[PDB]
Design a protein around this ligand. Sequence first.
Ligand SMILES: *Cc1c(COP(=O)(O)O)cnc(C)c1O
Ligand SMILES: *Cc1c(COP(=O)(O)O)cnc(C)c1O
Ligand SMILES: [Ca+2]
Ligand SMILES: [Ca+2]
Ligand SMILES: [Ca+2]
Lengths: 454, 455
Amino acid sequence: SLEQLLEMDRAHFMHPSTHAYDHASGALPGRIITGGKGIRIEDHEGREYIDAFAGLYCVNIGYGREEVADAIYEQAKQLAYYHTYVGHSNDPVIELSSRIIEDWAPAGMKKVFYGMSGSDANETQIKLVWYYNNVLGRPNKKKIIARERSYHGSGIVTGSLTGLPSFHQHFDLPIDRVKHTVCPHWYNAPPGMSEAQFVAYCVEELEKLIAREGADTIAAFIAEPVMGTGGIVPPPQGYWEAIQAVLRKHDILLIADEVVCGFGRLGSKTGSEHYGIKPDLITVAKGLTSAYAPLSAVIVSEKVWDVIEKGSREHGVMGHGWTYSGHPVCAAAALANLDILERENLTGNAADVGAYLQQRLHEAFGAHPLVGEVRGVGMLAALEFMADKGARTPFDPALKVSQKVAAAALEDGLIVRALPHGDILGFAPPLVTTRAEVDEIVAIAKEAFDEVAD
Amino acid sequence: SLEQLLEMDRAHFMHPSTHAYDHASGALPGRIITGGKGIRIEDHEGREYIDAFAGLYCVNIGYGREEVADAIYEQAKQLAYYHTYVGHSNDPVIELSSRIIEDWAPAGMKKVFYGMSGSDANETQIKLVWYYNNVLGRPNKKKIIARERSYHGSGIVTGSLTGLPSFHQHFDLPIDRVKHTVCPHWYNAPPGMSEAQFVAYCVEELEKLIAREGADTIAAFIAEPVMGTGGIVPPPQGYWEAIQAVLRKHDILLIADEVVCGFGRLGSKTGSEHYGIKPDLITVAKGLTSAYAPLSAVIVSEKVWDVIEKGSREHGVMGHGWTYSGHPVCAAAALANLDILERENLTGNAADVGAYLQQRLHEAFGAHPLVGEVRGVGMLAALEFMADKGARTPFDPALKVSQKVAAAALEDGLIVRALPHGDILGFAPPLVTTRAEVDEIVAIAKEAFDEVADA
Ligand SMILES: *Cc1c(COP(=O)(O)O)cnc(C)c1O
Ligand SMILES: *Cc1c(COP(=O)(O)O)cnc(C)c1O
Ligand SMILES: [Ca+2]
Ligand SMILES: [Ca+2]
Ligand SMILES: [Ca+2]
């Protein structure tokens, strides 16, 4: 019974990112998702929704892929699990590793280490950067620079990297080794710069942080090529070239968080490829498997892998491992996911239909007095709402405009996300989305928005 | 083509817990596992092995359960994933949560929060204990006490909780908020002590740590009911009763790490049930799914859940979540796993055949001059080897006796683990293991051991 389900939920399930009391008490009503196909999902009540956020930037090949379910089945049946400790392996993990390196990763990458979450992958990154510096005799080169409004996960170290305050509240974060520099959102500049001027500003602010802390104390800089949860923010043109030069000058490792941007989302293999970023380390999850099974990976450059090898010769086996590291079923899911991305050229579809999404959002919302900015890249897009446009001046957060539009859209059968920063409505549809589906998405969001606007 | 696999592996796969250079260079040969059935696995080759470590204390219902593969398939096909943010749900996660609380958790537990690893679950625990204290207006009550030789995971915070130095080296751990008290291994007590004396020693050492740090600054104490990777160490008689009294007196939360002990391993539902532990918080993974899919959970007491609710009313939504929190496929795997544990009464089999394992290891090894100690409980057991027994004096670690026995056992078709701490050979067979299979396991390990002992 659906009613006893919902009581069991309220009584016993602690959800992620859900108001504990309001949920437990019934004030925040629960929604049970039971099926889905293509870009549409279905709740327990039989209501169907267009999921223009692809779960959480992650159901990239779309819902209901029997091909992946069969791949998962066949592996679960043959060998669901053995460990990968002390050189042990399984077939799928071997194939997946060489495929990630040969076909998806930028040049210079060498090794892949697996977990199950974006958060655990970034945890691994910070371990590796500390290990690297310790084996090189640099015990104080340990601080990590992240950015305001960044999202890097929800643990203690990874929640510190995260530049959104909700992940810090009552958790004593950020930790002391994590420092935050500026969010590269041109729309929000010092308030009259050229794009190039704003880049130079971001560069000087980073240079100031480095000077205050001391370059010899900074191990790494971590960043999303395009900001996701912080509010769908492409980098300014020239940003990545200029930031990379600063990091190289100060011998600071670069970690590209590709959890959202990875595996076709922007119309390129990765955000790194898209923007000419040459990271030392890369974090992936989400579109790695299109969420069909949980899997994360850390991709390691030749340079860093060489120091890891060196560490092992001098100090023996590195103490790092998860029980389910390289889980056969999860690896098999990833292989089928990649087969589908590649065969259907969904990276191309993301570029193509993603540009159409940008176009249609601009046409629909660009001229409107309450829309401060329309922005995006590939199959990511956002609308940022402003009380005055003009003066670039945001609504009283108590008004909750982004949230009211999202709610209205949901009533009309469309899922889009109110992002945690400001009044921002985000779009991250599956990479299989068609032009017609975009027009359908935009029509509903447009109606929703007018209803709230009035 | 097997050769091309192994090259691809060496070229591109960074393994957990694997010597990086020795593996990449071919000095540490790789092993590809391709199949398995019951308690036996098969490598690429075709060599078959009795897996008396059940993967990593985790393949509890045994290998090749088509029933679980079908359960995984059916969920993957119907709905592999949606998120569980902002009150969203799927039914396997709802059923699993109420089943964990009603059927497996000790009394007083209320809510379950999901991840994918033992490590992420303990990460969540520490977040929750800090949140708890912050919403109660106790900003300084934040330190965590763990134990020497404990294993709690392999992250930064969870690697700090972990009391084994290999998880610390070149990672700048433990963090300052984590303190370690003594390992409750009677066999390594300060010499001469009675079991009861050694308990009282553990108690006084904990009391000293609490006095030095200030009880006011200590949020929680985390511990495995029985130590796993640190050496298969049951707690001394009376340990848990006495430790619990100290924690209660100082208002310190107790986190039971049931990652190994959970879901039947000791012949009880949990280590907590087994030893009368009343934790505020419990961590589970491994036997939660028998490793058929990755899943972890944090089980939360009524007391702690009440404060979490309070936090949300006063401060709004707690900022905690994993994208794959409550993953439908993983939850479905767990439900089938539980169906099998319950239907086959594998908790009972673990009690029964586990006691037999203890008996048979004692009979086979108890008298031998090179075996310092035989120990265990339920379906966990270990042999600890000593150069001198009556002097309690261990071999030169470069001799690596535990590892030589393991190697010999592997040649003879048996997988048992050389544990990282001492010269210790561990046993954690699947909970479906039979008495005859135990005798088969012990016979091979006994032969292996003689070969190494006579040398
Ligand atoms: C979602 C996300 C993470 C963390 O992933 P989890 O699987 O939720 O731990 C990290 N980085 C980015 C950019 C993300 O979007
Ligand atoms: C194996 C283990 C962990 C960590 O589990 P992962 O799934 O490897 O992250 C934590 N606690 C205990 C007691 C364990 O045995
Ligand atoms: Ca409407
Ligand atoms: Ca079947
Ligand atoms: Ca033999």
